[PDB]
Amino acid sequence: KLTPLAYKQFIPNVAEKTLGASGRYEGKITRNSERFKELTPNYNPDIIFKDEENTGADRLMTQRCKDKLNALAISVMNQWPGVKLRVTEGWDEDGHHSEESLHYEGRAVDITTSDRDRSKYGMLARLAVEAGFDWVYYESKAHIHCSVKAENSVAAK
């Protein structure tokens, strides 16, 4: 049934910013920016947020990102009861990602299972695809990168 993604594999098998995947980068969103209004905090009790910066930034994301993440939170517990979805990186306020990263606009999250059992990540990535994320990439052994389209792209003119 559900086949895990392999290390470095991405679904769909196209570049992230293509229309069939997560679409175009709309630009960085910062706390001081006009675009900040676009982000809403996700306080789903079934999701662990690393929040290493202690700023709550990992929780701020677009509605579509929230929707897909919330659906994934359900499938993770269904796949491994007692284990929760965990976000290690979300909206990046400090340039820790490549130029034009969707993390800069709350459209991407790096995830793991709460038990940090890396053998579960290929399968987690698959659940992420079934959860509706527009692009899922088994980026590193430490996490799965998941991104979504901007609302402008979901209903493109």
Considering the complex, what minimum distance in angstroms separates the CB of residue 29 from Zn ion? 15
Give the x-and-dash track for 56-95 against Zn ion (CB under 5 A). Answer: ----------------------------------------
Confirm or deny that 62 is annotated as ligand binding: no
Q: Give, as ranges, the residues between 103 and 142 that touch Zn ion (CB under 5 A).
A: 108, 110
- Residue 140, token pair as written in the block: 């590193």
Confirm or deny that 26 is annotated as ligand binding: no
Picking from 101, 104, 74, 76, the residue whose alpha carbon sits closest to that of residue 91 is 104
Considering the complex, what minimum distance in angstroms separates the CB of residue 1 from Zn ion? 27
Confirm or deny that 103 is annotated as ligand binding: yes
Instruction: CB nearer to Zn ion: give 109 or 123.
Output: 109
Considering the complex, what minimum distance in angstroms separates the CB of residue 31 from Zn ion? 20
Picking from 19, 49, 11, the residue whose alpha carbon sits closest to that of residue 127 is 11
Confirm or deny that 97 is annotated as ligand binding: no
Picking from 157, 52, 67, 140, the residue whose alpha carbon sits closest to that of residue 106 is 67
Cis peptide before 81 (omega within 30 of 0): no
| Cα-based angle 56, 150, 146 (whole degrees, multiple of 5) | 60
Helices (H), the chain: 63-79, 121-130, 151-154
- Residue 126, token pair as written in the block: 């698959």
Give residue number: closest CB to Zn ion: 145
Binding residues: 52-53, 58, 88-89, 92, 94, 103, 110, 145
Binding residues for Ca(2+): 52-53, 58, 88-89, 92, 94
Q: Which residues bind Zn ion (CB under 5 A)?
A: 108, 110, 145
